């Protein structure tokens, strides 16, 4: 570790710490920066050499964390936690969690190499027939094809190609991760990840929220299953069984907006999927990013700085470089460099993703002058909610009209149902998936789910919560959880469930602050400087204060609350319940064993 980066001397008392954190920060920014830069160089250009460089940067960060962390415990382990400065004990608390720096050097190196190899396997996996990538090729197939066999080829191909080789690496990763966090006093890595929400009742609170939301999902599920039955027929859809997992528009069946055209209740009203209009008008990634930016500046939040435009990767490279296409936002911790890395495609759903990613960047811009340990969301769910809240305004028919994407204007009950159904496909359909992923992973970290049951427990959860089934037989050689980005890329998931509840709480509060008095689902906060100021207060806080307090200031309640989501969807919630009753549906999937048959001649009968 460079002499300039090593910790010096301090008093073994409460006073010996503010100068400590200032010195830490001076060096931490340099270390964080070099780590983020090496990660960027790999993720935008996957090579063995860039993996090696990223692994060297990771070792340095671990050296740095070990040095600064052993000092805390030398000086303060018996006595720290006690009074004056709130932001200071947060900064200290973060410095003394060693994590992977607890591993001996050989295991640090193994851990870093595992992360690099898992990332490569996921982001370079292909389905061969010249071979198809996940993004754009398989993603486009899942979104647009109505060929059962083609969808199956893409789904099976992807899950086999990505999941199977990940399994042994994921096992080794899990063991090392647990070994690391156990030395910080956590029972397993999952307990560490949950500790970020600073709630002794987190898992119970989540379960109680899910109980309120589940009826909405079950009714959406039953209606969508019927719509699919009318297209695919009785061979491939069981009206009392789980929906085959490849028919819902998305590789993970995690959101269903791409099958909107099959489910739209009133097809004679204006067409709310504006993708075809975006393509007709010649939108490109650049336009999408500038349009999102202009929403942020309408609220008097910050534009994207020049360094963002110069350094970001906004389209998949056309030079045959391998890249991590999965959309992500990047803080370089130098208060200057902030970037998005997205293989942007021209679609409505991608415009929402652009807003999502830009919300992260806006957070980074607003807290860039805080101490580096405080440059985080109030919790990770807050970070995920910011862009989505703006996208809720952008997606309204009235806003789409303002930006030239929806010519017809209508305000009638049928049009409302269409809109709320489209939004339900995006937001309600996600809820079970958002909830189940870290239920799976928490069980893996705890040892409740050993390698012998990775797939059995994954599919238990997928069927339990989503009411889907794999469209081909699976066994434990398959590792279908590994075919979802966040698993091999070690990114926690519960943040997205939290976000999907939180964003409606934020939307309600911002709409009220804006002076809007109509139905919550027709609110557009565009050009509300007052809504902008309220949001800015959240963003500038970082993690300086407990999330419960930040939330209370913003929305008037100190807790996650489903009521604003329920209020937003009330009309369609009622409508779906009535339609399923009238159509004679069974809610749920009592034929829980059911899987669909294979297509004739599969896979040979596909062009
Ligand atoms: C789409 O129509 C919604 C319903 O409009 C109402 O009913 C129609 C049949 C028609 O007669 C129309 O003229 C009616 O107003 C609109 O929602 C309504 O928007 C009103 C204006 O913001 C709102 O009003 C009052 O709301 C409260 C009282 O509950 C007062 O505090 C406030 O001062 C307003 O005067 C009304 O409540 C609201 N209705 C509902 C059911 O929410 C909606 O704005 C419109 N949308 C668009 C995009 O045009
Ligand atoms: C796991 O499954 C592998 C391939 O899939 C198999 O073939 C299809 C047609 C299904 O109907 C079912 O028979 C299987 O899922 C097999 O190669 C492999 O042997 C299986 N793994 C183990 C340990 O048995
Ligand atoms: C990709 O990385 C390699 C090192 O592995 C380097 O030689 C090459 O120039 C990089 N390409 C781009 C376009 O940055
Ligand atoms: N980074 C986001 C991408 C998206 O919103 O589509 C998740 O994961
Ligand atoms: Cl999280
Ligand atoms: Zn995000």
Curated annotation (Swiss-Prot):
Inhibitors of ACE are commonly used to treat hypertension and some types of renal and cardiac dysfunction. This is Angiotensin-converting enzyme. Monomer and homodimer; homodimerizes following binding to an inhibitor. Interacts with calmodulin (CALM1, CALM2 or CALM3); interaction takes place in the cytoplasmic region and regulates phosphorylation and proteolytic cleavage. The lineage of its organism: Eukaryota, Metazoa, Chordata, Craniata, Vertebrata. Ubiquitously expressed, with highest levels in lung, kidney, heart, gastrointestinal system and prostate. Residues 11-590 form the Peptidase M2 domain. Belongs to the peptidase M2 family. Disulfide bonds join 128-131, 325-343, 511-523. It comes from the Eukaryota. It is found in: Cell membrane; Cytoplasm. Dipeptidyl carboxypeptidase that removes dipeptides from the C-terminus of a variety of circulating hormones, such as angiotensin I, bradykinin or enkephalins, thereby playing a key role in the regulation of blood pressure, electrolyte homeostasis or synaptic plasticity. Composed of two similar catalytic domains, each possessing a functional active site, with different selectivity for substrates. It comes from Homo sapiens. The record marks 489 as: Not glycosylated. Phosphorylated on tyrosine residues on its extracellular part, promoting cleavage by secretase enzymes and formation of the soluble form (Angiotensin-converting enzyme, soluble form). It is linked to Ischemic stroke: A stroke is an acute neurologic event leading to death of neural tissue of the brain and resulting in loss of motor, sensory and/or cognitive function. Ischemic strokes, resulting from vascular occlusion, is considered to be a highly complex disease consisting of a group of heterogeneous disorders with multiple genetic and environmental risk factors. Chloride 1 binds at residues 197, 495. Zn(2+) 1 binds at residues 356, 360, 384. Induction: Up-regulated in failing heart. The active site is at residues 357, 486.
């Amino acid at each position: 570790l460079d002499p300039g980066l090593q910790p010096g001397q301090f008093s073994a008392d409460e006073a010996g710490a503010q100068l400590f954190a200032q010195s830490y920060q001076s060096s931490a920014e340099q270390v964080l920066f070099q780590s983020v830069a090496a990660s960027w160089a790999h993720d935008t250009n996957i090579t063995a050499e860039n993996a090696r460089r990223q692994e060297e940067a990771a070792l340095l960060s671990q050296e740095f964390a070990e040095a600064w962390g052993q000092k805390a415990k030398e000086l303060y382990e018996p006595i720290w936690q006690q009074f004056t400065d709130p932001q200071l004990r947060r900064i200290i608390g973060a410095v003394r969690t060693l994590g992977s720096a607890n591993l001996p050097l050989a295991k640090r190196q193994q851990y870093n190499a595992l992360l690099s190899q898992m990332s490569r396997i996921y982001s370079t996996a292909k389905v061969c027939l010249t071979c198809w990538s996940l993004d754009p090729d398989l993603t486009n197939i899942l979104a647009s094809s109505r060929s059962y066999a083609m969808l199956l080829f893409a789904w099976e191909g992807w899950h086999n190609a990505a999941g199977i080789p990940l399994k042994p690496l994921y096992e080794d990763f899990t063991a090392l991760s647990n070994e690391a966090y156990k030395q910080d006093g956590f029972t397993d890595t999952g307990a560490y990840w949950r500790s970020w929400y600073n709630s002794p009742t987190f898992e119970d609170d989540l379960e109680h929220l899910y109980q309120q939301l589940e009826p909405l999902y079950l009714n959406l599920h039953a209606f969508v299953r019927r719509a699919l039955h009318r297209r695919y027929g009785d061979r491939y859809i069981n009206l009392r069984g789980p929906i085959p997992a490849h028919l819902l528009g998305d590789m993970w069946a995690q959101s269903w907006e791409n099958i909107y055209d099959m489910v739209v209740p009133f097809p004679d009203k204006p067409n709310l999927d504006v993708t075809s209009t975006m393509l007709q008008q010649g939108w490109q990634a650049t336009h999408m990013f500038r349009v999102a930016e202009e929403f942020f500046t309408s609220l008097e939040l910050s534009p994207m700085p020049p360094e963002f435009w110069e350094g970001s990767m906004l389209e998949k490279p056309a030079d045959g470089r391998e890249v991590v296409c999965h959309a992500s936002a990047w803080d370089f911790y130098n208060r200057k460099d902030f970037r998005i890395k997205q293989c942007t495609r021209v679609t409505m759903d991608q415009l929402s993703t652009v807003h999502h990613e830009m919300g992260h960047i806006q957070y980074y811009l607003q807290y860039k002058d805080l101490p580096v340990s405080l440059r985080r969301g109030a919790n990770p769910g807050f970070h995920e909610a910011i862009g989505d809240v703006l996208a809720l305004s952008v997606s309204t028919p009235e806003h789409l009209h303002k930006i030239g994407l929806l010519d017809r204007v209508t305000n009638d009950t049928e049009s409302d149902i269409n809109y709320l159904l489209k939004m339900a496909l995006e937001k309600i359909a996600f809820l079970p998936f958002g909830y189940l992923v870290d239920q799976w992973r928490w069980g893996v970290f705890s040892g409740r789910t050993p390698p012998s049951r990775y797939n059995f427990d994954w599919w238990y959860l997928r069927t339990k919560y989503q009411g889907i089934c794999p469209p081909v037989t699976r066994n434990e050689t398959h590792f279908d959880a590994g075919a979802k980005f966040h698993v091999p890329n070690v990114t926690p998931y519960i943040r997205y469930f939290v976000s999907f509840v939180l964003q409606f709480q934020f939307h309600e509060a911002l709409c009220k602050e804006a002076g809007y008095e109509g139905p919550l689902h027709q609110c557009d906060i565009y050009r509300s400087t007052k809504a902008g100021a309220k949001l800015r207060k959240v963003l500038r806080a970082g993690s300086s204060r407990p999330w419960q307090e930040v939330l209370k200031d913003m929305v008037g309640l100190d807790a996650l609350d489903a009521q604003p989501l329920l209020k937003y969807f009330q009309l369609v919630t009622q409508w779906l319940q009535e339609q399923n009753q009238q159509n004679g549906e069974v809610l749920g999937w009592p034929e829980y064993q059911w899987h669909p048959p294979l297509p004739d001649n599969y896979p040979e009968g596909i062009d």
